[PDB]
Write a protein that binds this ligand. Sequence first.
Ligand SMILES: *[C@@H]1O[C@H](CO)[C@@H](O[C@@H]2O[C@H](CO)[C@@H](O)[C@H](O)[C@H]2NC(C)=O)[C@H](O)[C@H]1NC(C)=O
Ligand SMILES: *[C@@H]1O[C@H](CO)[C@@H](O)[C@H](O)[C@H]1NC(C)=O
Ligand SMILES: *[C@@H]1O[C@H](CO)[C@@H](O)[C@H](O)[C@H]1NC(C)=O
Ligand SMILES: *[C@@H]1O[C@H](CO)[C@@H](O)[C@H](O)[C@H]1NC(C)=O
Ligand SMILES: *[C@@H]1O[C@H](CO)[C@@H](O)[C@H](O)[C@H]1NC(C)=O
Lengths: 106, 227, 102, 52, 46
Amino acid sequence: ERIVLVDNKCKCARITSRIIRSSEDPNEDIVERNIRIIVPLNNRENISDPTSPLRTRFVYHLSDLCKETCYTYDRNKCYTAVVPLVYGGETKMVETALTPDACYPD
Amino acid sequence: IRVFAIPPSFASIFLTKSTKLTCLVTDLTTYDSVTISWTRQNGEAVKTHTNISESHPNATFSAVGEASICEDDWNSGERFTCTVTHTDLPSPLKQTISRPLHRPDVYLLPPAREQLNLRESATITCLVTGFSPADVFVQWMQRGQPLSPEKYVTSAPMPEPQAPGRYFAHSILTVSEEEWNTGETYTCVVAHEALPNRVTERTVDKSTGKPTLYNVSLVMSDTAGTC
Amino acid sequence: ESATITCLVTGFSPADVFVQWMQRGQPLSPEKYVTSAPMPEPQAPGRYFAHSILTVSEEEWNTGETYTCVVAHEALPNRVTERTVDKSTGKPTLYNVSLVMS
Amino acid sequence: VSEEEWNTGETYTCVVAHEALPNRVTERTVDKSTGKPTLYNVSLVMSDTAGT
Amino acid sequence: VSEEEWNTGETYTCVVAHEALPNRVTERTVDKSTGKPTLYNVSLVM
Ligand SMILES: *[C@@H]1O[C@H](CO)[C@@H](O[C@@H]2O[C@H](CO)[C@@H](O)[C@H](O)[C@H]2NC(C)=O)[C@H](O)[C@H]1NC(C)=O
Ligand SMILES: *[C@@H]1O[C@H](CO)[C@@H](O)[C@H](O)[C@H]1NC(C)=O
Ligand SMILES: *[C@@H]1O[C@H](CO)[C@@H](O)[C@H](O)[C@H]1NC(C)=O
Ligand SMILES: *[C@@H]1O[C@H](CO)[C@@H](O)[C@H](O)[C@H]1NC(C)=O
Ligand SMILES: *[C@@H]1O[C@H](CO)[C@@H](O)[C@H](O)[C@H]1NC(C)=O
């Protein structure tokens, strides 16, 4: 029986807990808080704006996410950044999708 | 014929969502069909006594001016004069009661391990500090199930040592050890003013207690944006 | 801002308890620690419960002082009884920390 | 591109337009530290492990 | 005490009485976990 305390989707923290049960006796059960953080290793300060360089710092405040920028992309919401595309002398300002198969129109 | 005015507790308007006025009169002489005047600044009369004991073996006939009024009227700070009209007193005396702001600092503390080692029972406390109004009520609730009033007891208001204006109170729902260690949910709620919302729900469990083990699972994978 | 320490004690049949707090064996002023009056217990009317609440700075808590709660009662064989809290007074807190690089 | 441009590399983007894209435009970004990096310089800090 | 009794983790409180003590007597407690610093083991799995 694993209970999920909090879960920040775009940070991918997944703070969970479970009470392991030993033989019946005066209480010696080990309470544990189990987290599973997926570091990107390739994302930027903005995951949407390509101009920002690679981010080395990886900040994970547990209390801040239990209750802004983050590292992991989401599969539900869209990340759209404005991008310039030029054909000839003039230019047209167009949208783009940073990641594929995430929130394509249906 | 004693003269004294007692204000109803602010916990009454949260427990029953109503206000019940009461005048503190002790050992008034038993007389048939007594009348009591409880006048506010408007001077309106008070509704008659309800559920009173006309005959008392100890002759303690308390004169209670029971009535139902809105909380706005009492919160306005109006002067409340208890005119104790009686045959014995030709000129009744007047007694006045009135009330002249920080959010409650409420946190729930897990029980000690020594109590669990003793196996007799378990005691959990709910610390309510940092509140300027004198009165405060704490209710204990397990998954929406009300309890007996005598199982949990609240403490009298005492001045905070750091700040004389602030007050502190401790509330306990003492329980058995088995109900604690099987993971049954315990919630603490406070009914106090000077708060953004009406009540704040606070809970603690064995799982959400002191954790001994920590297996963080940080996967350094080039794949990103999938979870 | 600060750390609040409460002292849980129950079971007063004589119903007469005094609680004292000291640091490194040096008794503290009565202003800092306050003792609540005894009150009846739901399980047994004979047994009472009392509390002491100490208001100390959090930086002093992080130093790891003794913070003993001396409870004095007639029924105690030595007429006093104190317990010591510390930064690691509870479980040994073994860590299962892991780092995956798959 | 020149080699000194790749040194302290700037963000080079590949923007392509086609019918089958969801938003009709996609973008891929590479630099020195992303495309086949020599080293993975990361700083990983955790604070307040006790939580609330 | 026996080794198994020490394994059971009993209180084993030592109490000492003297006139110079503030309460004339003081107590201390020793267990198996009276020390036991936090155990950190790290895993590196790929
Ligand atoms: C990097 O992050 C900043 C965070 O503030 C972003 O700047 C703004 O982000 C909001 C979020 O959608 C946009 O609505 C604004 O238009 C952004 N500002 C500008 C000037 O574009 C943005 O993602 C990045 N910063 C910049 C300067 O591009
Ligand atoms: C931590 O260990 C327990 C086994 O006691 C396991 O069930 C749990 O999944 C582990 N946590 C993570 C994040 O894998
Ligand atoms: C870390 O310590 C715990 C405590 O005994 C142990 O169960 C766990 O297996 C240890 N981790 C590893 C990787 O050995
Ligand atoms: C965490 O500790 C438990 C002991 O209860 C052990 O079985 C488990 O393998 C540990 N987790 C690891 C080594 O990832
Ligand atoms: C690598 O990371 C460390 C710590 O974040 C930093 O001090 C150093 O400048 C970085 N070096 C490069 C080449 O990015």
